Design an enzyme around this catalytic site. Structure first.
Site, short mmCIF file in Angstrom:
data_model
loop_
_atom_site.label_atom_id
_atom_site.label_comp_id
_atom_site.label_asym_id
_atom_site.label_seq_id
_atom_site.Cartn_x
_atom_site.Cartn_y
_atom_site.Cartn_z
N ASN B 186 5.42 -6.77 8.20
CA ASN B 186 5.88 -8.13 8.76
C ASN B 186 7.35 -7.76 9.36
O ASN B 186 7.98 -9.16 9.49
CB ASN B 186 5.80 -9.11 7.75
CG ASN B 186 4.31 -9.11 7.15
OD1 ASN B 186 4.02 -9.21 6.02
ND2 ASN B 186 3.40 -9.46 8.07
N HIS B 188 10.05 -6.96 7.71
CA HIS B 188 11.07 -7.16 6.50
C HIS B 188 11.48 -6.01 6.02
O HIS B 188 10.71 -5.18 5.91
CB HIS B 188 10.52 -8.19 5.56
CG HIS B 188 10.21 -9.76 6.10
ND1 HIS B 188 11.10 -10.59 6.59
CD2 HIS B 188 9.17 -10.33 6.16
CE1 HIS B 188 10.57 -11.78 7.09
NE2 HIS B 188 9.23 -11.60 6.88
N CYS B 223 18.12 -8.80 2.97
CA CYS B 223 18.98 -8.04 3.92
C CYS B 223 17.99 -7.96 5.34
O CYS B 223 16.87 -7.61 5.25
CB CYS B 223 19.07 -6.77 3.53
SG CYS B 223 19.99 -5.42 4.95
#
Ligand SMILES: COc1ccc([C@H](N)c2ccccc2)cc1
Ligand SMILES: COc1ccc([C@H](N)c2ccccc2)cc1
Lengths: 265, 264
Positions: B186, B188, B223
């Site tokens: 995804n 991330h 992050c």
């Protein structure tokens, strides 16, 4: 995994993991590169090695990759089983070659293939060596005698010279450093990390709209644990071609040069 | 892998790979963290999750890790088979808990154990939400009713508050950036990358002479792909360390944690 009936090649099935896939829910080229490395390591273990010979261990000699060439037609999806067959061959006194064939486990269709060139190097002095005839006999018993090539073609893309990228580069990714996860069991930076660093300078738009078909990577110098690398890329070209260069952030010492071929989705 | 007979937990065997091991030829804690993540995904897939349920998809709700705690006794060596059993449980309206037990496939002995706390979050607004009815009922059918804890001990290391590291830090690793291999499906940064970044500030002398026994990590902020992180460590003491991950620029806290190391 197991050696084939003739004992001259090795096969292994891999189930693609959740953390091994990208945005398209298929395995990344770095995941493929890890699997080829893993199946090559298990081939050496299954043939009585641990992949230096008796004479190489005595003479402080190791195999180092000079070139890696990967060609992918279909990336295995998350949860799919990919079967990889690998074999080695002697190329005279220059060194050895390892080839790989990737197949779909449900259909039996060839979804990818790879080839790599390995030269001997003294562990300590870092000086390259031509293969001694005694060393050649020690592993000729594990290699097919007749030529068996993953890339048989008359003038294939795996044996072509790569030029040096000239400044200014079109794209760049600066300040790349390896972490402990990038090191192998002997504390060297894993060969797969260099592939990832090369691809870091390809724009995210190209990665989102294209698929990686071919990658050819030449290894010139080893990145140390405390080195910092710069990744440079320039479009050389429905298909897109790129020229790549990895170099030390400071003095510009060349560590890698390569080329990628991308097809529009 | 497969669900156990009662359908309330999931088991899977993993053969440790050459690139998954460190200098002692045993699996790294990052390799273990990836395997726990993998076995948790396969548990969700086997119980009918294509694990955001059907109601959470309509509400744009996701599960986010708040805390991960890992305790290892014996790291599996290169070529060994490790069997991991995982299960989920509700913890009222706070969220859910996922526990793991790691075993040696040849001896049947417990070589490790883990626990994690997950809270609900709206995908878009990034606002945490307490777990509501209908959602609780949707996955209570996949969780044991009686409490089943990997860390049963009343008031244990996994449920303890972590302080904030004060400047100046004893050790530091600055300018850490994620690459595309650090991203999940995804886009991330996956939770395992944060563990690796925490350990980057531990000196190589401690890593070469000690083995990691316990790691507890709190997730505060995510992050981004274009963020740069600083990893800070201070010896609090076996050896104990206090850890802090923060944005290189403004010093925004992304993680805080503690590690416990035993002398080899
Ligand atoms: C034929 O290709 C190579 C040959 C040697 C190296 C080696 N790791 C190295 C390290 C430091 C300095 C120079 C060479 C790497 C690639
Ligand atoms: C309770 O633990 C968490 C809560 C929220 C986050 C989340 N990734 C985040 C991203 C950006 C800004 C703020 C929150 C992560 C952990």
């Amino acid at each position: 995994g197991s050696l084939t009936e003739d004992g001259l090649s090795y096969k292994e099935k891999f189930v693609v993991r959740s953390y091994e896939v990208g945005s398209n829910k298929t395995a990344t080229v770095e995941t493929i590169a890890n699997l080829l490395q893993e199946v090559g390591c298990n081939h050496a273990q299954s043939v009585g090695f641990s992949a230096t010979t008796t004479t190489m261990r005595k003479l402080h000699l190791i195999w180092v990759t000079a070139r890696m060439h990967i060609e992918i037609y279909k990336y295995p999806a998350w949860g799919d089983v990919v079967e990889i067959e690998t074999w080695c061959q002697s190329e005279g006194r220059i060194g050895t070659r390892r080839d790989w064939i990737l197949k779909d486990s449900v259909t039996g269709e060839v979804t990818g293939r790879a080839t790599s060139k390995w030269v001997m190097m003294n562990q300590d002095t870092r000086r390259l060596q031509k293969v001694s005839d005694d060393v050649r006999d020690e592993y000729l018993v594990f290699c097919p005698q007749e030529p068996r090539l993953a890339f048989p073609e008359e003038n294939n893309r795996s044996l072509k010279k790569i030029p040096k990228l000239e400044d200014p580069a079109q794209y760049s990714m600066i300040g790349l450093k390896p972490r402990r996860a990038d090191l192998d069991m002997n504390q060297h930076v894993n060969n797969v990390t260099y592939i990832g660093w090369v691809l870091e300078s390809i724009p995210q738009e190209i990665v989102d709209t294209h698929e990686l078909q071919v990658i050819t990577l030449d290894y010139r110098r080893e990145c140390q644990q405390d080195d910092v690398v710069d990744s440079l890329t320039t479009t050389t070209s429905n298909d897109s071609q790129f020229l790549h260069l990895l170099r030390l952030s400071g003095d510009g010492q060349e560590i890698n040069r390569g080329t990628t071929l991308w097809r529009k989705k």
